[PDB]
Design a binder for this molecule. Structure first.
Ligand code: HEM
Ligand SMILES: c1ccc(Cc2ccncc2)cc1
Ligand SMILES: c1ccc(Cc2ccncc2)cc1
Length: 395
């Protein structure tokens, strides 16, 4: 019989029995309906096929199951979406991202310098969460001593998207947005008067076919980037490193052969799938991989389920840094394929290279620990990951 699950309940995604439920879906009802009737594409094939049909599976109803659209690229269809994406793309050209390498590396070394003398840290609190926050904060002009403020606002906003909030938590979300709005409009005004080379400066100057971003659009698109920057990669850093530590043959392989790091990062992404789902709204009734879908309902794309689909990935519960091919869907596919994917990959590579080299005997405090995952229906990963290592002097 079907698993009795609610795919909008954050407790489902904090359960290490989610993957057992996904297995049932893929084998028995690939386009699954949960206990409340919510539709979800569980196979790699169904996710790809929906992604390739944006006119039928739209983003314009919003990408969460129980919330309306916001005025940002991810909640738009082409052609409007393409113009918005092209405008924002000025901040994420291959050259502009690759040029951040030196500054990202410096942040990695500063963060490791803060714990390397101690012999213990919480990998989540001290390395995985702060590095992406510092990178994206630096891009947006956030002072180092205000990073924690922005990360708290970000946590509130992604929690709003990851749940059905109470009235008090709705008020907190609105207050967080108001504070972000205020800060960002001050930045816009300053960069319109004295442009620099930071992200707001590049976005203010971006032009596509005589069109530019308005101040309202700049606020919304930079907020999408802030939350991508500081609520996603952290979970691949923590959960990916956790798999290296739980399978020490994998750790040992990477330490003796740095040319394996690109494939390792892709396997960390496949495994961790920090974005558990994005929704699509049906523009018409349709029969889709055996399940009848109705115009106006939302269907989830289950990216973690796709990433463990045995039709595509041999022995998917084996973590293998050498996996080739590894065409995972952690960043999605198609029109809305993550705009930040290169920056996320660069952060993952640079921090993991340095962790391997500077903390070479890193291990989990309890090798048979089951560590807790964040209850959230949208983005999730490890809450805490205590690790020990031989101390060393800072750089
Ligand atoms: C490992 C980290 C990340 C993961 C797993 C992730 C995942 C995703 C996914 C699944 C989508 C939607 C794709 C679809 O529905 O097919 C998306 C879109 C997007 N992401 Fe990320 N993301 C990450 C990091 C980032 C970062 C660092 C940024 C910016 C600095 C960013 C900016 C965006 C933007 C702007 C979009 C919307 C693109 C569009 O609608 O055309 N993301 N991301
Ligand atoms: C409107 C609040 C909000 C804005 C952007 N992301 C989440 C919540
Ligand atoms: C609205 C929609 C999504 C997000 C989170 C998000 C951002 C970038 N890539 C992956 C996830 C925040 C606000």
């Amino acid at each position: 019989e079907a698993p009795d699950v609610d795919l909008a309940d954050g407790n489902f995604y904090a359960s290490r029995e989610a993957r057992a439920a996904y297995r049932w879906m893929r084998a028995n009802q690939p386009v699954f309906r949960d206990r409340n009737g919510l539709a979800a594409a569980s196979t790699y094939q169904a996710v790809i096929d929906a992604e390739r049909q944006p006119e039928l599976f739209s983003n314009a109803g919003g990408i969460r199951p129980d919330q309306p659209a916001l005025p940002m690229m991810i909640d738009m269809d082409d052609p409007a979406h393409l113009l918005r994406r092209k405008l924002v793309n000025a901040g994420f050209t291959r050259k502009r991202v690759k040029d951040k390498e030196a500054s990202i590396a410096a942040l990695c070394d500063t963060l490791i310098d803060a714990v390397c003398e101690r012999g213990e840290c919480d990998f989540v609190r001290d390395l995985a969460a702060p590095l992406p926050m510092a990178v994206i904060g630096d891009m947006l002009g956030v002072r180092p001593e205000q990073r924690d403020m922005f990360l708290r606002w970000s946590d509130d906003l992604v929690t709003f998207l990851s749940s059905h909030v109470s009235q008090e938590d709705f008020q907190i979300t609105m207050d967080a947005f108001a504070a972000y709005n205020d800060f960002t409009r001050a930045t816009i005004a300053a960069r319109r008067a004295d442009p620099t080379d930071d992200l707001v400066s590049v976005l203010v100057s971006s032009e596509v076919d005589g069109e530019r971003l308005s101040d309202d659009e700049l606020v919304m698109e930079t907020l999408l980037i802030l939350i991508g920057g500081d609520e996603t990669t952290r979970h691949t850093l923590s959960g990916g490193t956790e798999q290296l530590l739980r399978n020490r043959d994998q750790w040992d392989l990477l330490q003796r052969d740095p040319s394996l790091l690109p494939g390792a990062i892709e396997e960390m992404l496949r495994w961790t799938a920090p974005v558990k789902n994005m929704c699509r709204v049906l523009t018409a009734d349709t029969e889709f991989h055996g399940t009848a879908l109705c115009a106006g309902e939302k269907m989830m794309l289950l990216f973690e389920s796709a990433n463990f689909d045995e039709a595509v990935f041999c022995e998917p519960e084996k973590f293998d840094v050498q996996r080739n091919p590894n065409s995972h869907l952690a960043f999605g596919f198609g029109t809305h394929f993550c705009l930040g994917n290169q920056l996320a990959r660069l952060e993952l590579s640079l921090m993991t290279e340095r962790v391997l080299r500077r903390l070479p005997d890193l291990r989990l405090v309890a090798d048979d620990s089951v560590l807790p995952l964040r209850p959230a229906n949208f983005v999730s990963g490890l809450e805490s990951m205590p690790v020990v290592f031989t101390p060393s002097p800072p750089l």
